[PDB]
Design an enzyme around this catalytic site. Structure first.
Site, PDB file in Angstrom:
ATOM      1  CG  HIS B 170      -2.183   0.732   0.895  1.00  0.00           C
ATOM      2  ND1 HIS B 170      -2.489   1.948   1.302  1.00  0.00           N
ATOM      3  CD2 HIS B 170      -3.214   0.284   0.113  1.00  0.00           C
ATOM      4  CE1 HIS B 170      -3.649   2.272   0.813  1.00  0.00           C
ATOM      5  NE2 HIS B 170      -4.079   1.260   0.103  1.00  0.00           N
ATOM      6  CG  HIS B 174      -0.427   6.187  -3.455  1.00  0.00           C
ATOM      7  ND1 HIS B 174      -0.939   6.956  -4.418  1.00  0.00           N
ATOM      8  CD2 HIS B 174      -1.475   5.567  -2.830  1.00  0.00           C
ATOM      9  CE1 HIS B 174      -2.243   6.851  -4.373  1.00  0.00           C
ATOM     10  NE2 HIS B 174      -2.550   6.030  -3.392  1.00  0.00           N
ATOM     11  CG  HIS B 201      -6.830   2.045  -4.806  1.00  0.00           C
ATOM     12  ND1 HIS B 201      -5.941   2.258  -5.764  1.00  0.00           N
ATOM     13  CD2 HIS B 201      -6.289   2.523  -3.635  1.00  0.00           C
ATOM     14  CE1 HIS B 201      -4.882   2.814  -5.248  1.00  0.00           C
ATOM     15  NE2 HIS B 201      -5.091   2.948  -3.950  1.00  0.00           N
ATOM     16  CD  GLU B 306      -3.557   9.872  -6.349  1.00  0.00           C
ATOM     17  OE1 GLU B 306      -3.385   9.688  -7.553  1.00  0.00           O
ATOM     18  OE2 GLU B 306      -2.664   9.637  -5.541  1.00  0.00           O
ATOM     19  CG  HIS B 321      -8.365   9.234  -3.217  1.00  0.00           C
ATOM     20  ND1 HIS B 321      -7.112   9.621  -3.001  1.00  0.00           N
ATOM     21  CD2 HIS B 321      -8.493   7.949  -2.762  1.00  0.00           C
ATOM     22  CE1 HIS B 321      -6.495   8.643  -2.409  1.00  0.00           C
ATOM     23  NE2 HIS B 321      -7.335   7.652  -2.253  1.00  0.00           N
ATOM     24  CG  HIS B 325      -7.831   8.730   2.901  1.00  0.00           C
ATOM     25  ND1 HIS B 325      -7.126   7.724   3.401  1.00  0.00           N
ATOM     26  CD2 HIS B 325      -8.402   8.302   1.729  1.00  0.00           C
ATOM     27  CE1 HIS B 325      -7.231   6.708   2.592  1.00  0.00           C
ATOM     28  NE2 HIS B 325      -8.015   7.058   1.606  1.00  0.00           N
ATOM     29  CG  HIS B 361     -10.874   2.727  -0.574  1.00  0.00           C
ATOM     30  ND1 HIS B 361     -11.067   3.648   0.355  1.00  0.00           N
ATOM     31  CD2 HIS B 361      -9.536   2.663  -0.842  1.00  0.00           C
ATOM     32  CE1 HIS B 361      -9.911   4.132   0.684  1.00  0.00           C
ATOM     33  NE2 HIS B 361      -8.992   3.516  -0.019  1.00  0.00           N
TER      34      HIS B 361
END
Lengths: 626, 626, 313
Positions: B170, B174, B201, B306, B321, B325, B361
């Site tokens: 994970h 990124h 994802h 994103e 996105h 978070h 997600h």
């Protein structure tokens, strides 16, 4: 002998916790302890989850039923090899305060054996990390202060709440008075424990309620309703026992039911109490109505409620005090599926940092205030010490009628509590509030041709409100703090008494570090109070403000031949904190209810109307030295 | 040289954190880093909070732009003498993946440099405490397992969510695709990053959605509404950077506005997007409408949502996105008055443990699913590889058509991450799910007199619902996971292909501990991927159940001369995980959208109706070895 | 009545007119309003643990059982085991069945309108129970046999106070036990909780002599097919806990010969007689257990026999 007595216990407490795991393949050894076991080591104890108290009552009856000073120690070597050491120290400290072969063994200092509940997780981690950073015998000193963006107003009062001596006193008061003190099976009783339990807690929260106004905030709001959310707080404390930490509460949290009690059986209990005040009686576990008296009523309501073991009814009145603590502290997680280490209200040493603490303590105080409230105000007759005239008081610090408070940086030796491994000492430099020394000069006209013996009760309240300057004494009784209480003898005519700060009847003077206990000094040979209970010295007079805030020093002289209990007890000893705490195997020396005058209703609008010629307000300033 | 390359960076990262505080009297030295110094050290880094990515994009552009391999290292010696380490490792792993002097450099393994975000707090302070308990060179091994009172159903799925390789992948995905990858100032671009960002994802959450049904639970519910409360969770993770910990969420909390964005401008972005789907276009930062075409649309919806620097519009589409978070993770404390270390969604390495992760997600997936949904279903024409007939498949593990999953206890070397001080190794023994090896035997009738070159896409879904057995393939597309994707050549007539578990195109095979790196191998010589990207091997096929649960192995053969991109790139290398991740400085090798066939709408009611003669379901069992 | 209410019944009105208490819009209430419909609706049990929680307080202020009190002197339960098709499993089934709608609704024409339903059942089985009757005299016992679960929904935890909510009495009888090694063997059918044979309206329209009492004798008793719970396809693992208390102690004056609902003497009873056993229905498991395993609670006249149940799919 009492030297080697010390030289066994404290050596075991030289790096305590790890003693918890040892070779006990068969518990059976202690038919005594045989019954304990739904808590294997660091599965963390909510002190209030009912099952573990039961498990511990097995351990209390086992640990007591001993032979002598030796067999006591053996039991303490052995049962320790498996148990939740927190409970074990709680048990050995209720013991090595009170089972009569022990005088002069001092309880290992909780601040120094468990520093984690007192300081920032960071400064534990730092001192630790500096011993890993330089493997040398050099001491490490870390400045606890920290650096961060102060959004919050309340962080100010963290001078007081979070203090070493503050939080230690708190454990120590209930190590000297345990809720589970059964009198009969332990031979003797505990003088005035319920009432004293109102009082000490009001005096804490009244010192606090001043500290709120000193800052220019309001007195702390009571947890009168259960619906209403609890405030948010992060103690910043990781526990030296396991990786984890006291999970920290966000605000906007409603109270929640427990696997033990509903928040509703709490409401029930309170209703069952409040009505019994109105009815003026209590039903013990036999159903018989004993009176909610002026004398006995408060000892018998205080055991009832706590719920002490001593209790007159448990199911009926609950343990509303303790029970509120479970629910206010497992406010993250009552269901307990998650296994988060609870909020700091679960223990008595951590408790005072978290702002909600006081919300519940005015609440319980509000109940006690109802009971005192149905009792009647004081007659002028009753308030009057005949013939003696208080011609005045004044305080001389550096100047007249100011006291000046300071900051004092200080240390706490982490080494004792955590593993230094290498170095001498890992020190946390903290910063605490203090005050200048000062005296009372009090002038009197003793009109009577005979010498008068008095008891002088001296108080500190605030003169201002947050509204404007308003001397409403019934309102002020919540804030009113007893600064001193003594006996003097007064010849005819003009008398002066002069009384210096130190000898305040509420205070510890000399605290005792584990190191001095490795040697021995002569003060008294006593126990878990000796140098650890008493209110701390630096918090004897609240912060005020940088301007000089304006307060009230209110004195009473009542009679000493009236007030002194007669009886036969001991020399001059651990009586230093006689007010907030007491003296050993003796009573509270003064006849009147702790609070007196200011226990009951005042119909009067100024503290001046309430003046008898044996009372006196001396308006004083406090200024924080920035 | 590239050896002493390794040998400067990782030595700085050796027992990394403590080099964050150093000597650098005046910033002025690096006229370059002028304006960044704007979070005081462990004033704890919450990455997804908008400012810290911006702060980090100062660092990305700085750390890229170093003269040669040497000047790069000097900058890295120097700026470090004051800066926040988490960000520093982030932006230098982005660098020492992608700035072209690097090859044969390995990123220090995050699980092993920061174990705290992977394991229980208990087993950290334990291994730690055992080095304080026995000051010796002996290794310590601690069993991570713990012993708790399991109320919660969800703790079951903590085989998968909380796994080492899971959470490492994970971060690594990124680190190989940073949102702040500007193409121009960094010379070159990042192939298909938005679309690949949908896909990886979805594939995570589809493996998970199987893991839910394996257990006999339902697929995970999407965060479709913002009002609706977030689930409760305790990660059990204290951070090695200080004493504190990720404050853990109680259930029953609604989502809260931020000092940056209101939950409403979040609501707007979503409306402004899903509308542009209906309208089928996007307005870039110049206002010009570029098409939401069939192919491109998903890379350009993915970059945008994103958001990346590649997000054609940022104010208009947000970063919906990332932004979700912040709010889902500072669910304790958005205002941030209380300074609590946020929920695990704030970082990419912790993220997958916390159950709400998947709720967001599927939500973003639901947007991507709309864009794919306005595109049309697949013609039988389009689905048909002409002439080749899949006469069948079967899997041979120990037996036919079962695979059998296991538990494997394992280790993670805490020593690298925390200070052993004395001992060799402090090990956390954990327990993880695994599977038996197995093969595909796939039979074909290649009717055409010419040899056929194919690309074989193989899938795993569930055959049961959590309701009764219902093969609704459009419903199953959320669950459908690509197990393999290869090229084979097929002579005329009856062909068999046999394909062994290992060579799955989604997986890491060999992981690499820092100890390997202390020496060096020739596998190849690449970077933050190499032995750290790829989905982990033990989670290649979900748990199923002890009974043997019943699933769907669905294969497609599409053409390889059609599917292979032509171009000129490299040997056989870090292509092992070509499916979930990719290959280096090359494209995704297959023409079709990642998901194919199962990207678009299926109007058909069984996966059997969807059968072309180049498709094949082979119904298989999975059984957990208890 | 005014002081205590009818809290039980009253909760039923409110839980069943949960659509419509004011009753303005005249809907036929939720199935909790009648005693025949009641058990389908999941909330039923939410109120029935609630009332049980009150009863549990009253039993809770009463004290736990002395070992003295728990001990039938001299008789030793050397063990039990169940033999179904195999040892220590019972195997449950599905049985399709009928119910004749004709009687209730108007057929008009046909013979019979039948609803084929499908219900859970179980294999037959026996207790084989071994005893050492140390006393030179023959002992008369009352044997209380129970079924609980051995697993939790967390892990395997034999907390018997927790288990008292789950504990079900499978059987309760009188036997006489000579000195020494005794075996008792007891077959499924003769469970004291159950109906065995029940009468269709048809049989009644004709005639039998089984005897002739009323709505208890057939119509009541717990049903046979639900005598032992479903378990799981794996074989779930449960607890068969037996007690032997004394029969001359336990007997209420007069043992009844005539089966008059007294097939189901346990859950129900017998006609114009009392509940034949002195002790509170639940015994042993009515009161508090301070002990952490059902094993600690073992007297030599008690016995757990861990058994499996498996659903035949």
């Amino acid at each position: 002998t009492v030297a080697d007595k010390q030289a066994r216990l404290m050596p075991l407490f030289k790096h305590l916790t790890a003693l918890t795991r040892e070779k006990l393949p068969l518990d059976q050894r202690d038919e005594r302890l045989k019954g304990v076991g739904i808590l294997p080591r660091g599965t963390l104890f909510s002190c209030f989850h009912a099952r573990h108290l039961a498990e511990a009552t097995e351990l209390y009856v086992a640990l007591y039923g001993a032979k002598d000073f030796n067999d006591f120690i053996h039991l303490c070597e052995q049962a320790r090899q498996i148990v939740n050491e927190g409970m074990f120290v709680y048990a050995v400290s209720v013991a090595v305060l009170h089972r009569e072969d022990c005088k002069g063994i001092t309880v290992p200092p909780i601040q120094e054996v468990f520093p984690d509940r007192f300081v920032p997780a960071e400064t534990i981690n730092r001192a630790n990390k500096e011993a890993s950073n330089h493997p040398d015998q050099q001491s490490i000193v870390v400045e606890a202060e920290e650096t961060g963006n102060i959004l919050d107003p309340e962080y100010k009062l963290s001078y007081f709440r979070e203090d070493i001596g503050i939080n230690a006193h708190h454990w120590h008061w209930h190590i000297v008075y345990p809720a589970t003190w059964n009198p009969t099976v332990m031979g003797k009783e505990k003088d005035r424990k319920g009432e004293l339990f109102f009082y000490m807690h009001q005096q804490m929260c009244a010192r606090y309620d001043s500290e709120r106004l000193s800052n220019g905030l309001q007195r702390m709001i009571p947890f009168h309703n259960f619906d209403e959310p609890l405030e948010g707080y992060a103690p910043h404390l990781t526990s030296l026992v396991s990786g984890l930490q006291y999970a920290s509460r966000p605000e906007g949290y409603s109270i929640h039911d427990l696997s033990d009690v509903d928040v509703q059986d709490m409401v029930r209990w309170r209703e069952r109490i409040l009505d019994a005040i109105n009815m003026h009686y209590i039903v013990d576990k036999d159903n018989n109505k004993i009176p909610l008296d002026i004398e006995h009523g408060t000892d018998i309501l205080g055991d009832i409620i706590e719920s002490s073991d001593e209790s007159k009814n448990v199911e009926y009145y609950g343990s509303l005090h303790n029970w509120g603590h479970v629910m206010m502290a497992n406010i993250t997680d009552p269901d307990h599926r998650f296994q988060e280490n609870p909020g700091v209200m679960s223990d008595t040493s951590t408790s005072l940092r978290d702002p909600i603490f006081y919300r519940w303590h005015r609440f319980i105080d509000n109940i006690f205030q109802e009971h005192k409230k149905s009792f009647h105000p004081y007659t002028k007759e009753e308030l009057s010490f005949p013939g003696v005239e208080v011609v005045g008081v004044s305080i001389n610090s550096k100047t007249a009628n100011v006291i000046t408070t300071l900051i004092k940086e200080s240390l706490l030796e982490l080494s004792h509590g955590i593993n230094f491994g290498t170095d001498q000492s890992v020190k946390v430099k903290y910063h605490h509030l203090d005050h200048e020394p000062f005296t009372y000069n009090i002038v009197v006209e003793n009109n009577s041709g005979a010498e008068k013996h008095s008891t002088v009760r001296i108080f500190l309240a605030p003169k201002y409100d947050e509204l404007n300057n308003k001397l409403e004494p019934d309102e002020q009784r919540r804030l009113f703090i007893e600064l001193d209480k003594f006996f003097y003898t007064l010849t005819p005519g003009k008398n002066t008494i002069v009384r210096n700060h130190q000898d305040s009847s509420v205070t510890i003077s000399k605290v005792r570090t584990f190191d001095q206990l490795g040697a021995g000094e002569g003060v008294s040979e006593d126990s878990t109070e000796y140098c650890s209970c008493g209110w701390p010295e630096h918090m004897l007079i609240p912060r005020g403000s940088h301007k000089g805030m304006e307060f009230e020093l209110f004195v009473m002289l009542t009679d000493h031949d009236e007030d002194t209990v007669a009886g036969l007890s001991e020399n001059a000893v651990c009586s230093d904190a006689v007010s907030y705490c007491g003296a050993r195997d003796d009573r509270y020396p003064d006849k009147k209810a702790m609070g007196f005058p200011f226990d009951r209703k005042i119909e009067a609008r100024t503290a001046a109307e309430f003046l008898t010629p044996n009372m006196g307000l001396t308006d004083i300033k406090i200024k924080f030295h920035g």
